[PDB]
Write a protein that binds this DNA or RNA. Structure first.
Ligand SMILES: [K+]
Ligand SMILES: [K+]
Ligand SMILES: [Mg+2]
Ligand SMILES: [Mg+2]
Ligand SMILES: [Mg+2]
Length: 189
RNA sequence: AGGCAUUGCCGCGAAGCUACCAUCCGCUGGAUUAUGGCUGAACGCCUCUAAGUCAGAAUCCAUGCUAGAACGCGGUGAUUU
């Protein structure tokens, strides 16, 4: 069954301005600007008014129509990111060896450096993606906080960090050491 | 001082050849697999997967290394009385 018409609504809030042309979406808000190429999907965007964009699929199968609500979310997340922003919190976990995290520079680059992970002499390095901002909370012990407009950049940068601290040749039910995401949320709440 | 003994035999023997029996030398990028993830619908939830995407193997392709198509090509010198 091909559905004649499926349609999602994207609610644009007051401060933000969505430009779309040949499926290249630019969102511009208080916190800054995000773009996103969507030329990999056949959808049609339409402006109802200044506060509402519709996105529609015509004559689409089940798989095509599944993409449509994805498109809504990706554009909605662009808008959330450039008003409310994104902030992921990660805790360190360790039995014995204190994980020792800090920001460095390797040719004006920026890198989350992880020392002493399970007492390892290896120094782990994780690039900080452009537009992500790291900070170590004071109130909470052993907490790193990644933050940015782009949830895809923020969230991936946290995953990069979670994954660098995987435990090898040990039973990971026992050896629970790592840097895990504890809280996904916004900057302004 | 030499011949012959099918190189007469013995010790040393330079050069050459040669031995893990000797010495030297044996490169670093990218793309991936399994797998673990990100964002995320389908399915108001969930989900690494469907669109999209990150990391990743003694793998693969380059880099590097050998040959150089005798019907692949370029540059350049001189061209006879
Ligand atoms: K003789
Ligand atoms: K998810
Ligand atoms: Mg064991
Ligand atoms: Mg896919
Ligand atoms: Mg030839």
């Amino acid at each position: 069954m091909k559905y004649i018409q499926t349609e999602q609504q994207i609610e644009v809030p007051e401060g933000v301005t969505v430009s779309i042309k040949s499926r290249i979406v630019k969102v511009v808000g208080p916190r800054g600007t995000l773009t996103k190429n969507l030329k990999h999907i056949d959808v049609t965007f339409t402006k109802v008014n200044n506060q509402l964009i519709k996105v529609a699929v015509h004559n689409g199968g089940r798989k095509h129509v599944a993409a449509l609500r994805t498109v809504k979310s990706l554009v909605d997340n662009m808008i959330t990111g450039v008003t409310k922003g994104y902030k992921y919190k990660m805790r360190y976990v360790y039995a014995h060896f204190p994980i020792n995290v800090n920001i460095v520079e390797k040719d004006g680059a920026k890198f989350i450096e992880v020392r002493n992970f399970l007492g390892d002499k290896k120094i782990r390095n994780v690039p900080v993606r452009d537009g992500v901002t790291i900070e170590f909370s004071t109130n909470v012990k052993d907490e790193i906080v990644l933050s940015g407009n782009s949830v895809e950049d923020v969230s991936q940068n946290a995953a990069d960090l979670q994954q660098i601290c995987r435990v090898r040749n040990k039973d990971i039910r026992k050896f629970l050491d790592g840097i895990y995401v504890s809280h996904k949320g916004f900057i302004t709440e």
